[PDB]
Amino acid sequence: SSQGLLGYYFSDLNFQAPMVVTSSTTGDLSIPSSELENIPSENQYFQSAIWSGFIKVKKSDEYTFATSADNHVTMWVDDQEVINKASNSNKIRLEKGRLYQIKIQYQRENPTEKGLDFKLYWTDSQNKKEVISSDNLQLPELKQKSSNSRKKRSTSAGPTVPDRDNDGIPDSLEVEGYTVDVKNKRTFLSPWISNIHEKKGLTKYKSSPEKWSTASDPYSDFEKVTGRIDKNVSPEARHPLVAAYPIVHVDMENIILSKNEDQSTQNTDSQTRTISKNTSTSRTHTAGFSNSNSSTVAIDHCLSLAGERTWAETMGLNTADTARLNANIRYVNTGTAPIYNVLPTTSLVLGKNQTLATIKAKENQLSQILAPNNYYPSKNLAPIALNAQDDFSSTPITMNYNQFLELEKTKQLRLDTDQVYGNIATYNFENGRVRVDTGSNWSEVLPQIQETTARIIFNGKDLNLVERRIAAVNPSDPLETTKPDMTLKEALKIAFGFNEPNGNLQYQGKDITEFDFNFDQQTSQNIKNQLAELNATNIYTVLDKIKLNAKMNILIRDKRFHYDRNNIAVGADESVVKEAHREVINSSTEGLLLNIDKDIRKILSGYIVEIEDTEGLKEVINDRYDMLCISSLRQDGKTFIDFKKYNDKLPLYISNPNYKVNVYAVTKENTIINPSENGDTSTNGIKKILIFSKKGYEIG
């Protein structure tokens, strides 16, 4: 349980040096020395302490309060002192259902025991005395605004530990650095100490003492580090310097095109003449400073239907007909916080700006959460059809004849999704629960997050673009200057899980030098200036010295690949592609069996197989632009390149053992997706990469 009173335990006598900040479920406010391993022995002596929260009683009555050390205690119930350095029997009247503020201060110089043994009791009218039970105690209202029943500030009477933003973490800890450690029941927040915490691999937190959420998101610095937060929030965004917010795009998995019924045609019994294709969708980035969500859909160009007809020929579309599109999609959350009750609206766009459809889900009628690193619907469930089978009111996604031809030519669609994400599930200090709060909305949060953080977009996870935002100083905004300095190195560690085992920063085994850096213009000039000030000629050797600022944009990409203007991986150097195909497991006249890196496979559209005779002439076996999909990933994760698929199901016939079998890879950026202007559907002129070449006698 995360409920109870909030305690600050200080090594000094005057509430200045907080050693532990933690909560207690019951009136037992003790911290035994056995729980103090993350703090120096000499600091395990607590000379002062402050507790705060509320008391709720289940039964109106007159109660008497008392503690383990009334001679060292002053206690207030709603601004009223009930204990002052003396035990008493003064009976204060408490009404059922009503919430009373509690503040307790304790001071004792030169304690002879480490830790603190301290209990809060009360006695009712029937002379029954007990340690106050957990059902009667609540945390203070550590929010930016008071509740109707719970005031956000403690009584003005007595000591006030500096907590300028009311998040619960004392100013001094947020500025100087703190660590969070878990017991079995409780989280201790303590000052960072180099020689003890660094070796334990603990995380060193700093945050702004004047920003309740330092990332300007809806979860407080204290809520984050103490686990008083939506469990669906990404682990990295439990750091007060990492922004927690949703990021959504749409993934289209496949498409079906068909001819629209028309009033003039009474006949609806004709044969099916649809065009069904698989599609590949990637979230894009156009270095940029737009906070837009967009994804681009590539429609499969591989052979699907008999013949080499035009799409219009296939569907029987005349120049006056219209065509319809249906598709299967899912929503993808690549951000750091969940969505509960509004999915963002999406435009489906042909060419630069021809909106074909507006895709909307029903507000407050979501079938599940849309969680970070997850899909809606979940992958274990059917996807959403744009025109659902049940749904009478799904709008047809229609194209006129020329739009249809444009789609055939480009084989591309774009999905632009807005940033309307609905209500937020927040922590409630009254009951220690997380629930969707109707009074909290992502639209009130996103602008501030964007304005006060540096954005890093990184593709090291499967070459897909993942955006994170990290709290970073704005030298021009006084409030933002109260945040800790954020270095480029630290940002990569906390936002993306880079680590540094041997003084080299790595992402899952890959050195940082295996990725490039790309910035928007303002950011570029900023970083260039820093490097010059540092007398540094190479960014990779000074990542710990490069400071991020709010509104920076940083794009970091795997160096092995070529990228299009949407920053999607579309190719790779010849040398990289060749090497990636080096180790052959098996070869025969039936095909090749290779092990290919998963990332490499992502940028290949297909393979061309060829037999080269003794005079140097070449027979291309699968000699069509739509016949290059001859590779498949097997269960054992190896790739098979199938020579027979487009050889009429026959093994390669090699007339002479000195003939060669040549296999070439074709990257996405070099892929032909239409017949040439002259109508040629062959592979002639395709830019291709030789990846295997062996003579007949070397194959078998």
CB of 469 to Ca ion, least distance (A): 17
Beta bridge partners of 178: 191, 205
406 three-state secondary structure:
helix
Dihedral angle sign, alpha carbons of residues 370, 375, 380, 381: positive
Q: Residues 348 to 407: which contact Ca ion by CB under 5 A?
A: none
* Token code pair at residue 217: 């998101």
Give me the amino acid identity at 615.
E
Q: Which is nearer to Ca ion, 191 or 606 (CB)?
A: 191
CB of 168 to Ca ion, least distance (A): 6
CB of 212 to Ca ion, least distance (A): 6
Q: Which is nearer to Ca ion, 220 or 336 (CB)?
A: 220
Annotated binding site for Ca(2+): 163, 165, 167, 169, 174, 208, 211, 221
Count, residues near Ca ion per rule CB under 5 A: 6
Are 384 and 330 contacting, i.e. CB atoms less than 8 angstroms apart?
A: yes
Q: Residues 26 to 65: which contact Ca ion by CB under 5 A?
A: none
Q: Residues 70 to 129: which contact Ca ion by CB under 5 A?
A: none
CB of 642 to Ca ion, least distance (A): 60
CB of 493 to Ca ion, least distance (A): 21
76 three-state secondary structure:
strand
CB proximity list for 488: less than 8 A, separation 6 or greater? 539, 543, 544, 546, 547, 548, 554
* Distance between first and last Cα of the chain: 69
Q: Which is nearer to Ca ion, 32 or 162 (CB)?
A: 162
CB of 434 to Ca ion, least distance (A): 20
**DSSP H helical ranges for 297-437:** 311-315, 401-410
Q: Which is nearer to Ca ion, 255 or 494 (CB)?
A: 494
Q: Which is nearer to Ca ion, 75 or 449 (CB)?
A: 449
CB of 203 to Ca ion, least distance (A): 16
Distance CA 508, CA 499 (A): 8
Q: Which is nearer to Ca ion, 473 or 691 (CB)?
A: 473
CB of 484 to Ca ion, least distance (A): 11
Q: Which is nearer to Ca ion, 221 or 223 (CB)?
A: 221
Q: Residues 512 to 551: which contact Ca ion by CB under 5 A?
A: none
Q: Which is nearer to Ca ion, 221 or 590 (CB)?
A: 221
Question: Which residue's CB atom is positioned nearest to Ca ion?
Answer: 221
* Token code pair at residue 440: 């909290």
Closest to 334 measured CA to CA, from 467, 453, 231, 242: 467
Q: Which is nearer to Ca ion, 221 or 300 (CB)?
A: 221
What would the 3-class secondary structure string for 415-444 be? EEECCCCCEEEEEECCCCEEEEEEEEEHHH
Count of CB atoms situated within 10 Å of the CB of 259: 21
Are 154 and 52 contacting, i.e. CB atoms less than 8 angstroms apart?
A: yes
- Site mask for Ca ion (CB under 5 A), range 149-188, x = bound: --------------x-x-x-x-------------------
Closest to 78 measured CA to CA, from 60, 56, 61, 58: 56
CB of 167 to Ca ion, least distance (A): 4
For residue 455, give Cα distances in angstroms to 440, 518, 523, 592: 24, 12, 11, 43
CB proximity list for 326: less than 8 A, separation 6 or greater? 255, 256, 258, 385, 386, 387, 397
Task: At 438, give phi and psi (nearest 5°).
Answer: -60, -20
Residue whose token pair is 């710990």: 544
- Choose the stretch contacting Ca ion; rule: CB under 5 A; options: 112-120, 215-223, 256-264, 440-448: 215-223
Residue 230 in contact with Ca ion, rule: CB under 5 A: no
168: left (phi over 0), alpha (psi -120 to 50) or beta: left
CA angle 416, 420, 425 (to 5 degrees): 135
- Choose the stretch contacting Ca ion; rule: CB under 5 A; options: 146-154, 216-224, 452-460, 510-518: 216-224
Residue 207 in contact with Ca ion, rule: CB under 5 A: yes
Q: Which is nearer to Ca ion, 189 or 666 (CB)?
A: 189
From the list 217, 221, 230, 236, which residue makes contact with Ca ion (rule: CB under 5 A)? 221
Residue 21 in contact with Ca ion, rule: CB under 5 A: no
CB of 479 to Ca ion, least distance (A): 11
Annotated binding site: 163, 165, 167, 169, 174, 208, 211, 221
Are 55 and 99 contacting, i.e. CB atoms less than 8 angstroms apart?
A: yes
Distance CA 64, CA 83 (A): 10
Interface with Ca ion (CB under 5 A)? 163, 165, 167, 169, 207, 221
